[PDB]
Amino acid sequence: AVDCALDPLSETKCTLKSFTVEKGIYQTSNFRVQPTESIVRFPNIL
């Protein structure tokens, strides 16, 4: 049994549904910078 969030190798095997992964460049998910802040603006003192 293998986790799907432990390490990128585990994510790779979870995505490919295989436990013998040979050479190659693969895809697991998408990287994304989190919404660190939310920017609302207003005209200065309208």
Add this chain to the structure above:
Amino acid sequence: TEILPVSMTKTSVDCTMYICGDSTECSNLLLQYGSFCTQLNRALTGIAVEQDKNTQEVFAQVKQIYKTPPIKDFGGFNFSQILPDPSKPSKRSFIEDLLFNKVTKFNGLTVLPPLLTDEMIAQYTSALLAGTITSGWTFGAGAALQIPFAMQMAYRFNGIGVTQNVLYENQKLIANQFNSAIGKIQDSLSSTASALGKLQNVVNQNAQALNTLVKQ
């Protein structure tokens, strides 16, 4: 000028963020459609590797990169427009400069950069030229041998019904013919907007392919 699309705008769609604007339940409900966004993602990545090996099969007929010599002694055949000029930072050529000039990522769709750098695609092309020009018809069949250019052209005459007397008579005249045709092509590209049309529309039918995709 024979204009040919070879590589496409390699694109990929992350179905998590593309359709769903930061909604994990939206992505889960998309997975309740099953493998559609997954199968389209693998199909698009298949397409991407398709153009990557087309560049391996169109551009990279040579497994190992060649390079142009500083001295362009080709019997009067002027390639300053055709082979790259080391003076400018990129190792590309003037005709290709105009080619890139006459042509014209944010909404979830991502454009994969080419595995082979535009500079490295330029080195591909320069190697292919060096192979046809110095090496001849052999650089794609293993190891490149030496073949004189004019001795290409002589047997090329003999194969269409003309002798090779014109070599020692009119190397200069044949060179002037080739470069004058080159200059006429240069004027056509610098003037005719539709001269490269078959890439342009392919770029365009890619462009509003994506643009429709965002208009969609």
Add this chain to the structure above:
Amino acid sequence: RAAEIRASANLAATKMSECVLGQSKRVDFCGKGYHLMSFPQSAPHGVVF
């Protein structure tokens, strides 16, 4: 469209081999007339022979 470009890319490979890697004894394939030679030039998502 990529099937059109894949036909065009096998086309461009057979030109990178016939037009480029020798004399193409094929007529009206490497340009009109008794083809002599070809010279490729890169271009954004394409080639120019």
Add this chain to the structure above:
Amino acid sequence: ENQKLIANQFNSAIGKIQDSLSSTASALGKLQNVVNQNAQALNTLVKQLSSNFGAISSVLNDILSRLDPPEAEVQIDRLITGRLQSLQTYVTQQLIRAAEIRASANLAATKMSECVLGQSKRVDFCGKGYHLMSFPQSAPHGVVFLHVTYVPAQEKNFTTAPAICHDGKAHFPREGVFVSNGTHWFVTQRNFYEPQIITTDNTFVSGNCDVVIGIVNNTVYDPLQ
């Protein structure tokens, strides 16, 4: 002179390829990958049964027996609509894949004819390098071509000559060419080095000596002198 040597070269190539095929199981991946987008597609089709697309249940009987036919039948109709959309997508991508298969199949017909019923003059079409022959070998849902191709490996730089002028007539070699092996001068072919006597059989009168810079004189053989 060396039918035997060339035949053993061919046999050594065949043995190397059989060793590679017994060693590398991924060499048939070109079939395998294809059957995979046949396989996973067939998997997706099967997986498409597990995809409800908003259904309340996946079992066929668990839809009719619970809701009224005026509602249950419409539910079934839209679920079968989703299945038909899946079938359209599968057949469309399967038929573009089969367009690839058919482009490759006309390609393989031209390899079964151009390369098997003859020697294809299309370079890098039936194998890297100049192609000689092809051997088909059937394989699960495909063919395997053994491409017998001539590929040079080792190179040596040698010498040619621009022209020879004896008595006012410039001499080009119509077949052969003036070559030097380091100590001797002969006439040999373009692609193979076969030393030969310099005579009228290896030269021809063409061009002129009016332009050549670096003119040289050599011997021309007259049989009846």
Add this chain to the structure above:
Amino acid sequence: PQTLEILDITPCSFGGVSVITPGTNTSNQVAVLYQGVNCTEVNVFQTRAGCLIGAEHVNNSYECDIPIGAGICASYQTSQSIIAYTMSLGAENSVAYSNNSIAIPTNFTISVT
């Protein structure tokens, strides 16, 4: 709307995640490339395609084994680890040629591809 200024909106650094893992029976070290992003939320190397963690750039020329992108490709080499470098540019073999030189092929191979 507050001050008199014009600000470009570059859609915030986004892309996919590529994982480079060699054969499981050969190695278990996994490198991660973050496509289309610079090193923001991540020894560590910066490529045009994205940020590469778990690989060390090398200046030498080895066989290009696993392509990564933008001409950089990886190989499992020297402990052993993942090295990403500029794909092999080869030896330059074009010199001045004239009517007195040729490259005779002395030996070949009849290869069964």
